[PDB]
Amino acid sequence: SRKTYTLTDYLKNTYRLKLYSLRWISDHEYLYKQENNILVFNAEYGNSSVFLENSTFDEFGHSINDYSISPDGQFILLEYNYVKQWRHSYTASYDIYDLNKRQLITEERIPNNTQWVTWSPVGHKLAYVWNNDIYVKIEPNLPSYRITWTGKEDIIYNGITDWVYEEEVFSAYSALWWSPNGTFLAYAQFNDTEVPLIEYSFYSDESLQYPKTVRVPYPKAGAVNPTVKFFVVNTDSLSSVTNATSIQITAPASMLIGDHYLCDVTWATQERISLQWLRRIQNYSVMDICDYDESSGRWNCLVARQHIEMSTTGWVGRFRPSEPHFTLDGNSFYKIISNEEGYRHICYFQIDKKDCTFITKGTWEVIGIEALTSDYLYYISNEYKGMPGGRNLYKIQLSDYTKVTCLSCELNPERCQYYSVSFSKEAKYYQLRCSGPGLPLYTLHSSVNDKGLRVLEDNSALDKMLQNVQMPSKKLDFIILNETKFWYQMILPPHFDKSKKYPLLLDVYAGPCSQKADTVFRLNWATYLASTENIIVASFDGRGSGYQGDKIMHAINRRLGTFEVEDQIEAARQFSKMGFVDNKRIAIWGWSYGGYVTSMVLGSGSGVFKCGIAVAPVSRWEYYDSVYTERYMGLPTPEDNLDHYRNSTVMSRAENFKQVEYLLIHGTADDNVHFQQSAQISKALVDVGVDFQAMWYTDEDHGIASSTAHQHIYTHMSHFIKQCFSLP
Ligand SMILES: *[C@@H]1O[C@H](CO)[C@@H](O[C@@H]2O[C@H](CO)[C@@H](O[C@@H]3O[C@H](CO)[C@@H](O)[C@H](O)[C@@H]3O)[C@H](O)[C@H]2NC(C)=O)[C@H](O)[C@H]1NC(C)=O
Ligand SMILES: *[C@@H]1O[C@H](CO)[C@@H](O[C@@H]2O[C@H](CO)[C@@H](O)[C@H](O)[C@H]2NC(C)=O)[C@H](O)[C@H]1NC(C)=O
Numbered sequence: 001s002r003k004t005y006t007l008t009d010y011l012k013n014t015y016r017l018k019l020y021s022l023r024w025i026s027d028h029e030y031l032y033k034q035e036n037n038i039l040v041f042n043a044e045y046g047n048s049s050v051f052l053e054n055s056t057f058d059e060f061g062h063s064i065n066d067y068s069i070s071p072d073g074q075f076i077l078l079e080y081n082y083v084k085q086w087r088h089s090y091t092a093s094y095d096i097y098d099l100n101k102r103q104l105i106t107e108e109r110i111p112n113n114t115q116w117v118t119w120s121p122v123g124h125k126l127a128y129v130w131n132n133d134i135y136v137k138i139e140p141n142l143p144s145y146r147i148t149w150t151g152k153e154d155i156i157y158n159g160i161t162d163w164v165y166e167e168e169v170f171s172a173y174s175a176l177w178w179s180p181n182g183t184f185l186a187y188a189q190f191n192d193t194e195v196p197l198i199e200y201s202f203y204s205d206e207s208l209q210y211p212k213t214v215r216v217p218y219p220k221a222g223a224v225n226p227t228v229k230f231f232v233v234n235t236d237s238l239s240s241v242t243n244a245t246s247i248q249i250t251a252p253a254s255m256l257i258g259d260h261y262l263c264d265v266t267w268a269t270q271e272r273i274s275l276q277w278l279r280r281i282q283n284y285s286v287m288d289i290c291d292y293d294e295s296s297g298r299w300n301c302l303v304a305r306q307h308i309e310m311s312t313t314g315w316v317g318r319f320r321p322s323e324p325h326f327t328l329d330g331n332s333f334y335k336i337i338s339n340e341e342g343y344r345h346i347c348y349f350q351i352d353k354k355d356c357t358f359i360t361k362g363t364w365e366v367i368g369i370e371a372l373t374s375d376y377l378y379y380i381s382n383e384y385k386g387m388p389g390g391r392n393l394y395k396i397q398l399s400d401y402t403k404v405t406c407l408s409c410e411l412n413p414e415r416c417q418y419y420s421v422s423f424s425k426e427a428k429y430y431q432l433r434c435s436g437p438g439l440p441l442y443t444l445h446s447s448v449n450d451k452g453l454r455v456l457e458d459n460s461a462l463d464k465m466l467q468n469v470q471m472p473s474k475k476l477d478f479i480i481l482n483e484t485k486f487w488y489q490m491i492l493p494p495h496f497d498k499s500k501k502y503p504l505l506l507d508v509y510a511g512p513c514s515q516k517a518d519t520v521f522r523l524n525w526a527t528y529l530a531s532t533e534n535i536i537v538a539s540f541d542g543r544g545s546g547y548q549g550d551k552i553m554h555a556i557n558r559r560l561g562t563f564e565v566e567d568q569i570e571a572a573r574q575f576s577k578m579g580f581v582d583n584k585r586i587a588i589w590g591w592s593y594g595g596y597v598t599s600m601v602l603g604s605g606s607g608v609f610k611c612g613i614a615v616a617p618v619s620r621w622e623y624y625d626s627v628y629t630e631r632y633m634g635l636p637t638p639e640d641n642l643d644h645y646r647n648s649t650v651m652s653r654a655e656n657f658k659q660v661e662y663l664l665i666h667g668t669a670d671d672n673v674h675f676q677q678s679a680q681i682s683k684a685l686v687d688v689g690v691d692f693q694a695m696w697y698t699d700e701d702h703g704i705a706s707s708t709a710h711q712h713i714y715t716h717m718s719h720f721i722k723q724c725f726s727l728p
């Protein structure tokens with residue numbers, strides 16, 4: 001009987017979740033930012049002592065976008081003048097502050113408009129990229145050494161990624177990898193020479209007279225891809241007398257015969273490196289293990305240290321092949337692999353033996369390998385209570401695979417079912433982050449005897465606040481189709497009367513290996529819709545979804561816009577059968593792949609849905625990028641899968657839209673899913689006389705994430721929903 005969670009609450013952020021992010025700097029010490037000062041805490045006991053006062057950079061005379069303290073705490077890097085590029089990427093200005101000297105380093109600075117900077121992982125070495133060339137600083141205040149002379153805008157990329165590698169392979173702008181003690185610096189070089197440009201307008205500030213045409217090399221399904229080459233430089237033997245020597249490590253022969261990608265870079269020991277390559281047909285990948293050769297100065301990659309990974313029913317890995325975690329000697333390694341039942345479990349490999357041995361089994365999956373000591377492997381999975389939507393930390397005894405113990409399931413069972421972990425430098429201590437179903441809880445533990453020394457943050461203040469608002473409840477459950485469990489979640493309005501009939505809004509993503517039904521606690525506009533508009537908001541994970549094995553995940557192989565669409569419809573039906581849903585009032589909405597699925601549903605003719613909103617939807621797979629799209633579809637040639645490409649487009653369903661209300665929204669500057677896709681949607685709809693609502697957002701990207709634009713889009717969608725449900 002209090003006040004509700006309102007749209008203004010959501011947009012103005014009035015009820016905020018506290019976090020606690022630390023950074024381990026040793027085996028028993030981490031850094032936190034309490035009251036804008038950086039403090040160093042000592043886990044072994046309790047003490048805490050100031051590492052850097054907030055006042056230190058009162059004198060900088062620059063808005064400070066980001067900082068990064070070197071591994072040895074001697075130097076701090078200061079990032080200012082951030083100017084955005086894509087997603088994960090930018091340009092900035094950098095200053096280095098000597099913590100001993102308590103002085104800014106003014107001689108030999110890092111050039112303006114730098115693309116990326118990393119410290120070496122142990123000293124205070126620096127690698128940065130500027131105009132697409134790599135530069136190394138050994139001592140922070142002496143001339144950088146230029147590693148590459150070959151970089152060229154939009155063509156050659158040394159040490160940073162091009163659009164497609166950034167978005168779809170590495171999930172980062174960086175393409176540098178230091179060896180553990182910073183001796184070697186491994187890097188990739190991308191070549192976009194023959195890759196087609198996507199072009200689009202940028203309007204900018206009202207005063208720019210002629211719009212800017214932005215050009216990005218971007219391969220669409222089937223188009224010419226970038227090429228990759230791999231190098232390693234020895235940073236200890238750099239010199240100003242002599243251009244650095246980068247040794248090129250060449251891909252395996254099974255890759256050289258055709259288009260390929262470099263999909264993983266992992267260091268095994270101070271002198272051993274592992275590279276994973278993937279064929280453009282993502283059926284087939286090879287791991288190469290290369291040793292450094294103290295005499296010749298090169299890198300030896302023995303065949304029969306190679307390890308082939310094939311998929312007979314889809315692609316390798318969940319999104320890419322998984323990364324290996326080597327033992328300390330680097331002669332054996334652990335790696336998540338899909339087993340005979342098609343469930344992803346931990347595999348134990350010898351670098352010279354083709355076969356591997358599974359150390360876990362079961363109808364549940366390993367999410368990630370988190371830490372590896374000599375005695376124990378620490379990993380996260382969804383085994384607990386057979387819920388694919390939960391996460392917990394487990395540790396498995398390396399001498400007895402039967403001795404696996406669960407470090408988080410009993411910590412706080414009714415409140416915490418979604419854990420992620422951050423380990424100290426030798427897995428001595430670890431922090432546990434709990435994400436739901438209750439409010440997020442952050443604790444600290446020592447792994448010696450698993451004791452929970454400290455509660456870092458519990459969101460008491462937030463809990464207090466939420467007592468005095470009518471919050472919605474969340475149900476998480478499953479239904480059974482064809483002898484298989486498919487989970488869903490529902491956000492249910494306050495005072496939920498099982499007898500009344502509520503309007504329903506399907507929240508959809510449904511992309512391959514996705515998962516919208518989980519145990520995470522959230523404060524978002526579904527909260528607003530449930531709390532204030534008495535509207536049930538639902539998500540469902542049908543065919544081709546994650547973390548339940550390959551029977552479900554690979555179900556949509558070679559055929560997007562089929563099974564997952566069907567299943568989202570089926571879930572609206574199944575929700576009707578439950579009897580508290582007013583079936584004259586089911587909307588559906590989704591962004592990106594979810595916009596694609598929303599559109600496909602609205603055009604299905606099913607007659608189940610009254611209206612939908614599609615934000616930045618894919619409309620036709622030949623429009624999306626090669627890496628992502630071909631992973632699930634192969635090439636759009638008629639020798640391959642062209643039929644399923646063409647059968648599966650939004651525009652070909654245009655007629656059916658005559659039965660539904662449709663809102664179509666897209667940012668004009670979306671470099672990911674191009675405005676093109678929606679331009680094509682609205683064009684087909686016009687061409688068959690269908691009415692619909694639309695909205696462009698000038699200059700927004702795929703995120704539509706800028707403040708004003710974000711409150712605007714949610715307000716607009718709110719009005720469309722409230723109107724479509726004929727609610728006040
Ligand atoms: C990045 O990719 C481009 C595209 O391949 C590379 O440029 C191309 O390099 C090839 C050789 O690898 C050149 O072919 C040669 O051309 C000459 C005459 O042009 C011919 O007589 C030779 O026998 C050979 O056929 C080609 O010209 C060139 N193409 C373009 C578009 O410039 C480029 O070198 C790559 N950069 C890298 C990997 O660093
Ligand atoms: C390292 O390599 C570069 C690139 O080839 C050399 O730079 C060129 O040097 C030539 C010959 O002096 C000049 O004609 C060019 O103007 C230079 N290009 C650039 C971009 O500088 C450079 O001399 C080499 N340095 C060392 C130590 O050998």
Ligand SMILES: *[C@@H]1O[C@H](CO)[C@@H](O[C@@H]2O[C@H](CO)[C@@H](O)[C@H](O)[C@H]2NC(C)=O)[C@H](O)[C@H]1NC(C)=O
Nearest residue numbers: 122180181182183184234236237269270271294
């Ligand atoms: C980082 O590892 C490197 C390479 O393994 C270590 O350097 C080697 O050490 C041995 C014995 O000291 C030498 O004989 C090799 O020639 C070195 N390899 C090089 C420099 O290429 C080095 O000790 C490690 N770095 C630190 C800080 O300990």
Ligand SMILES: *[C@@H]1O[C@H](CO)[C@@H](O)[C@H](O)[C@H]1NC(C)=O
Nearest residue numbers: 034035036037050053054055
């Ligand atoms: C900076 O640090 C001091 C001392 O701990 C603290 O009292 C002060 O509020 C801080 N300033 C800001 C604005 O965060």
Ligand SMILES: *[C@@H]1O[C@H](CO)[C@@H](O)[C@H](O)[C@H]1NC(C)=O
Nearest residue numbers: 040041042045046047048049
């Ligand atoms: C914490 O206290 C211990 C024992 O009194 C001391 O040796 C150590 O220096 C302290 N650690 C820090 C980071 O101050």
Ligand SMILES: *[C@@H]1O[C@H](CO)[C@@H](O)[C@H](O)[C@H]1NC(C)=O
Nearest residue numbers: 093094108109110111112113
């Ligand atoms: C960066 O650009 C500014 C503004 O033009 C200039 O004052 C400064 O010299 C530059 N800094 C560096 C490190 O070159």
Ligand SMILES: *[C@@H]1O[C@H](CO)[C@@H](O)[C@H](O)[C@H]1NC(C)=O
Nearest residue numbers: 281283284310311312313634
């Ligand atoms: C994918 O690889 C398989 C073997 O793993 C190959 O036989 C097939 O033709 C490839 N592409 C598909 C699934 O058409």
Ligand SMILES: *[C@@H]1O[C@H](CO)[C@@H](O)[C@H](O)[C@H]1NC(C)=O
Nearest residue numbers: 481482542543563566567570
């Ligand atoms: C169950 O069986 C039918 C017929 O084989 C199939 O078309 C349907 O998609 C299946 N349902 C699911 C969700 O697998």
